[PDB]
Amino acid sequence: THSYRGVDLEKLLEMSTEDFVKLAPARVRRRFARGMTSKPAGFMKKLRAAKLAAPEKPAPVRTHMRNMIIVPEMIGSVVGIYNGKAFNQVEIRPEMLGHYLGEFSITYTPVRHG
Amino acid sequence: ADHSRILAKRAILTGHPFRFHKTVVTVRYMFFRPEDVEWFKSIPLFTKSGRSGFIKESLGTHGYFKATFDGKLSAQDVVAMSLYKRMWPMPSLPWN
Amino acid sequence: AYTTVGSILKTWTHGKLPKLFKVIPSLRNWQDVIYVTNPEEWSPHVVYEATKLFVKESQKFINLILLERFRDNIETSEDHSLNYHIYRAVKKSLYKPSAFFKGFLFPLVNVREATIAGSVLAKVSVPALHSSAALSYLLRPTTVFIKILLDKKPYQTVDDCVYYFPVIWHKAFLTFAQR
Amino acid sequence: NGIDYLALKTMLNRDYSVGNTIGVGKESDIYRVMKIHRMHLSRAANKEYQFMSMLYSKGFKVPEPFDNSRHIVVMELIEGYPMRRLRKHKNIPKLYSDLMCFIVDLANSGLIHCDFNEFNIMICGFVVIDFPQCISIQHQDADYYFQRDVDCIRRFFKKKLKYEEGFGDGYKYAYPDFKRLDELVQASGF
RNA sequence: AAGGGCACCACCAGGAGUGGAGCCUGCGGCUUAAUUUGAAACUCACCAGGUCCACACAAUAAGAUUGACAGAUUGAGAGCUUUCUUGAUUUGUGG
RNA sequence: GUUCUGGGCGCACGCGCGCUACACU
RNA sequence: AUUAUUGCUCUUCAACGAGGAAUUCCUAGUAAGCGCAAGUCAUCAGCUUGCGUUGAUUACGUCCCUGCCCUGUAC
16 A cells, blocks of 8 residues: 555545644745745635535646645645646646645756757 | 740738847737748848848747847838739630 | 834735725824824835825825825936826826815926926816816916916906916917917 | 858859858868868968868878868768767777877878877777878978877877787787878978 | 067966866857746746726716725636715717 | 736857866975 | 755765867966955855965066067069
């Protein structure tokens, strides 16, 4: 099974955010201790409604919030992440925990000097 | 009778230069796709005030371009380019 | 101290204005307490927002600092011209003409500032019963803006021409002949 | 200085690739490869073209010259890479041996290089790409410059490759020595 | 309309170096939606995507219009649901 | 025009000013 | 602070053996070695200017090279 720093997947999802922050490395702990802004609350509000009404997957919700931490409450959701130009569609698998959303949408093309 | 009397249908496209720099100017409305700016890149430009110039490259997705000219331009000038098409005579019939 | 609300005045134009400032006009002492908000630190967007919220004692605000910020904004601006939101606030002023004249008019009596101010004062209509008083005060080149205020097309106005009888001074005198 | 553009006109008309920029240089600029020399005296280019043409008329491993006019020269583009970054060739003993025999040929043709060194050899498996300030075999310092080349190539094989009828181990003699066409192009020393 | 003078941005006698390796950085070129001409926001001037904003005739109004609680809608939102409040500027065609 | 959110100020290569070294001073 | 500002700890250990053709600065408390302070600045320099510490070798000349300034015939 999946496990995070020794905590098993089935005890995750039950774990709250304010519990989860105790496991995370220093960058995450400072970010929450310094007080995360209100802006995720509206995103979280919408994301819950889509999951609850879902028939099976919840279909994408899209956002500009690239600087947002992935947190267990949102596991399994499908999200469209803005790219400065387009939206990229991603599904929150459990391995994504503690990463920033921005890591999944590439702001620049490759270059090949053709 | 002279079949060599070639007729060419001339066309003039025109666009507005709107931002100005010490080495380049950029022009709107002449094209609307980056693909078009690239396809017609090689044709020389001229101002009606008489300066010549050339396309550098496409800028952005709306078909803006930026270009270089013989000297200072300003928004009171217009940028044009000329194109030519072959024409042929039609036949004729008696009248009574 | 009111600076706990006044500290936000440097950015209030980005969105919904604070209720701790927007409620301030509800207090009759606010004509003196409003100076406790540090209004000179207010961004022009809030000055425009405050101008819409400031709507005869209101002339004590319009002339008490608003015209001072106007002259400071044009005189302090690196291009010598009022900022858009100050200009939009100025044109958004004048909702009472006697306040515009009694506050912004006679106390305003360089030439580059008079021309810019006139370019707003021609932008909207005015009541003829007020314009008759404006001509009498203008009948008192910094007064040459009276050649624009008369361009809108009373027995005391005829008498003012008899008491008043550059190319703008001759041109304004010619326009005063148009009947 | 519009000649810096208009000089093309003979080559532009007589020559078909557009070519591409390869590098700015101090004496000349290089751009299927075109070399442009650097107001009057450079029309030097004829000296270079005839010199290269002669050596390529011989059997030497040099690029074929195609055409030359108005201080413009066109040459075969090189396929290899610069020797100074070579580290692992599969037959270093034959490579050492035969670089030595190349010097013998120049001496038999009466010529000596000034700087037969890794900055102008490109990767027999190799080609020699230019001949700055060449001298005749008759010049008063010919042997001094001759031995410098031999030791220069020996030093490289020692330091990087650790190497240290033919020449070297497996042949009767370790390396050539000075005592063991100039009049057509009298670069120096008749 | 050939001689003379002078200078380590010239040399001579030398010193310390550059050019060779890794990295920082300026320009050209390449790439890209844009890579604008003591840059994480702004700066910022570039890109994608969102709101919001003369006069003369004919129509129109004592309700022309203005403003404000609680709540709303998008990828980016605020007195649009609700209902009080104020009192002379709105819609077409010809600068 | 005004203003808000996100992005940008990448590298096959050529030229130049620098930093750190190749050790026993 | 993700495509990562800076600092700390452990681990990984690349090229490089004094560098071709070319080429820069300099005559005494000067060159060179070494470090500090200010500047910009929420944070962030291997940058710029100033300051101090240690402290040489080689000329005291010339028109060879480069460049500048004076006074009609093979061009």
